[PDB]
Amino acid sequence: DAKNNLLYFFDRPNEPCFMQKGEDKVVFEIPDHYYPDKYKSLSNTLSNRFGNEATKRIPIRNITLPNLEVPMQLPYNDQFSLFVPKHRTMAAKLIDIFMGMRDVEDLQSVCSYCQLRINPYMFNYCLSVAILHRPDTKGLSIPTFAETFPDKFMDSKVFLRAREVSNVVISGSRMPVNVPINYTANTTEPEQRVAYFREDIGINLHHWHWHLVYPFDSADRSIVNKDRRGELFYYMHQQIIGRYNVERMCNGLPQVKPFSDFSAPIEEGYFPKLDSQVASRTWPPRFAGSVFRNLDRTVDQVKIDVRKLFTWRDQFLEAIQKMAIKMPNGRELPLDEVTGIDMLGNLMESSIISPNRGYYGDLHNMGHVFAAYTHDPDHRHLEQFGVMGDSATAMRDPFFYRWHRFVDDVFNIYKEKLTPYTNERLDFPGVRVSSVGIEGRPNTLRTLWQQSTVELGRGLDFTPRGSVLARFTHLQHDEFQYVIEVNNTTGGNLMGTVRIFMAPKVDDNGQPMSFNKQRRLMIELDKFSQALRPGTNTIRRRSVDSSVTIPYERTDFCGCGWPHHMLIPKGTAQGYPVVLFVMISNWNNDRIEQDGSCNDAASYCGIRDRKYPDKQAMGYPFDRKMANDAATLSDFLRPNMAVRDCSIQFSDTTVE
Template sequence: FDRPTEPVFVPKGDNEVFVVPEEYLTDRFKPLGSGLTDRVGGGAKKITVKKISLPDLSLPMQLDRRAKFSLFIPSHRKMAARLIEVFMGMRNLEDFESAAVYTRDRLNPHLYTYALSVAIYHRPDTKDLNLPSLAEIFPDKFMDKSLFARAREESNLVEINQREPIEIPRDYTASDLDHEHRVAYFREDLGINLHHWHWHLVYPHDGPRSIVQKDRRGELFYYMHQQVLARFNMERLCNNLARVKRFINWREPIEEGYFPKLDSLTASRNWPPRFNNSKLSDIYREIDNMKFDIQDLERWRDRVFAAIHSGTVVDGDGKFVELSESRGIDILGNILESSVLSTNRNMYGDIHNLGHVAIALCHDPEGKHLETFSIMGDTATAMRDPIFYRWHGFIDDLFQEHKNTLPRYTTQQLGYSGVRVTLLEVQTDKTQIKNKLFTFWQQSDVDLSRGLDFTPRGPVLARFTHLQHRPFTYKIMVENTGSPRMGTCRIFMAPKFDERSLPMLLRDQKNFFVELDKFTVNLKTGKNTITRKSAESSVTIPFEKTFRNLDNQRPAAGVQLEQFNYCGCGWPQHMLICKGTSEGYACQLFVMISDFKDDRVEDNNQGDNRCADAVSYCGIRNKMYPDKRSMGFPFDRQPREGVDTIEQFLTPNMRIVDVAVHHTNTTVRPGVILEDN
């Protein structure tokens, strides 16, 4: 993975180098002969690469080495699917390694890194390997371009042990004259963007069916992105912005411009900006082998609406498939995204992916200027752009349209007879403060050196500023009048008031509820006290997995990468709650204990629990989604007749409490122990 544009036989670390068969060299290097292949500094470990019969790479080779790669562009998608197939098809680890070495110098580095990551994640013999952070391999997708010149200066002039981290200012992409900039810290957060890249890596929409077909992947596409919107909306409300306006009229100019200020280190084209009031056009780009009209998108959208209202979709043979209460959302997810599991791509098209493309290419829809796509075209960067949320607002609206047709949950389905929640509170750790949460800014460092191909080598750190919160603990008291039994504890939080400071109606508020945690509890007869720490959340990955603690976790010489437990899918812990306001932002915390016998999933697969930090948004590798209820339960449907507020919605096994989120505008240095602030 390291230094993706350098030839593979150049030593990557201090301690190892690949020795490749001569025919693995590209045409440029072949004449230089075998001397090249074992050109190593003293003492480095040589890894001899096995000669295998070479796979047919003609398809993925069509993408230029210096082009950009987008999972949303159909022709790129096919190339990636082919390369994944090649990697997945290698019979053993040695052959896989050999194929990876051979392809690396021939293929586009972005395409290569994506396909290699998917293969490592899905192959049984590499599942123990952990992927390096994409922010380290392609730092140019995550940080300000001015940084790289400074990094070059630092690494050329300053000895390794005297180097200082290069600070990235918090406000580099825009000024507060642009209202949307108030939530730039959310959109541009490193951890959030890494989560999104990893999610799409774990749930590829194309490639061999064996890796695409995962339990409820279409539903998870809906739920994960719905939660991103809920979180973003909450963040907007506490920054005095109205909720996201869905992007529904594609003929209208897009009000929000965005200038990413990212610079591509590896491609010959940079990330183009989008000016205010840009308009979409029909796409006809021979260079990408791609042609579609806005009208195609509209036609597909109308067909999906019609399908939702009739309760059925039509498959490729003209047969009706019911959008049932339990399976409908999963079917729709695959249709809308779309994935290769779509019931009928001819009929329902490829709405979400091509929407990303139309937006990403609105500055050069016909390729006249030889420009390439903007950040909306890459899953590692798309969430930086305000339009991402407006586009997904439209996509989510289609899902909600389907959810609105489903029967409402009855009190019987929501309740848990004999179980009553008698107390819910949350306490900031190491204080006596109850029902107040605290946020502030923190700095963290990322090592850029894997991704920078200039010498001299050695770590070069970039220093980010991101939101952080003081850890807290939930306390829940439950009375059980029955025999000992199990329950699922579901914790959500939502804003209490809308944009006009009026109490929210539940039919609105339900879409704002952000999942904070979900876990199984054992209830004994009588009184039970449940405590749970914010860091244990089932939606997040620990802070250290987003920002590795560089001093403690840098691999010592000889230590293999697999000793890092780096499973990147999961919302970053430092973004678990919204920023709040200085005077305290009013939220409602909600807890529900549901009946475990309705939640339990029978799954005898061993699975892989090491990457199971963020199961709510990412599932568990090689296992079924561990909760039988609809994702988002109990807020995934309209409330029952006569229920207007969350208070009226409650059954005895639920409880709410008012919580205020307070923000202090101070910044703490890296590694400061949070509880002591």
């Protein structure tokens, strides 16, 4: 109960928790000394006011109050982001306080005290981390972040309308508030052609949830120290960039250009058109042609020149040239075959488990901070950060992909130094995959637009209770089934890892690609274990069972994962040519033996508090190159692999 009572802290985050909570009109018995200074003199009155007609009163246990001086340094009405150095310090302290409470009733009591005092975004974040790690709050799910703070995910005009519906339509049916799909720029903006991907609520949520579950800094290194999280940092973002590039190519745009010269103008501006109720202010835009400028923001404890990014970049290229990193003791640590990419991920992000954070810096994170503050690099204008500044919103900005293509280019310099996989490494003797395909018009995928609803009523502060739906339009695909034909010629049962990817057939200039190029555009569709009899086998796999995605209705905690409706690229009206690829590797050499887990969406998210369930490199078999730069995918193929030409056909039609 106390455990389940915690969920009330995700309801109406800007309303003081002495007010009625939930749709059921419950109140906490907030003690008088918990009331904020401004309300202390009226605490009797307010208590009576909100307790009137309450269906249930929840007692608050008397505790020794913790010292909140550190986390109270963030203004109640500021934005919160982990990218910002001082926000890391404050969040770690508050997480440490939440983790240290002896029991759930004590945790409830301290949460009520904090809710009334702490920045609501920081409170939300730290309470969520605590709920995900405390042994006594296991099997508690975090209420969907997009319904707690829906203004992070849609045009601020939505809330105008929603506040009107909520207050005026006091009886009878309500129509959903329409969420405009095209709103940040005109048709006359090329970048607007892929706004449906950048601004997708499921994609932004996956990004929030991934960083929530794999934080780069926290209260204890053990929260950060998850299995292969450095490598997963690389991979999850490599796949984002792959997916985004396909999308660009479906819409007549060239592939994203990396932001590798940190001094260059950022040609693509972005006007997010978002508003924050917590911060009581709109998000600042970034005008076209803006540049990174030297940072000195005392309030954020960030101070760093653009020059520094060049220094850090050069240090990386040198480490990769030597395949070795400088250590604090003046000696060197090899970048070895098994853990090299993981080390690099932690060096680059960077995270607290970086081998040498002092020297190698915080390159990727500072990139977000530079980009987020081009308009107010020294705080003279008292401006908050742009959307690049917050992991819930950063994917909205075309610049995100330029930054991540740069970061992925660095990781890829290392990946291309690794020895190509030998035939023996790749092969699964006795197993020949004769064909792969998609059932149906065979080998055809269909996409279209779909309208779905999200509930706004939990996140719309100081409005009447009741349902206020909003209706959004997003990409969607028809469901389908893979068919794989395989000969087991050995005389006994074998276990395989089936690995499914797709890539564009041609590049942005309409030309066939070498393997070394195309491999970077292989987007993961599935990974699963499969039993294989003597001799012929027909494997049928449903699109809905993908190891990459989570279902719509999804949105224990089990919220990380690519949204299912974005499993396949938009394609085109004429039919977009892709290659569907399958490999079956030897499961004996891939599996990890280990023990009630949510094992949804393991490809990009791993398995919470377990080992990443595949011994192979993330993105196998495409993470390494071939020796021959003119070699093609056909030249790659080994007997346990198969390819099929497929088409993705977009219908510019909308369903409900």
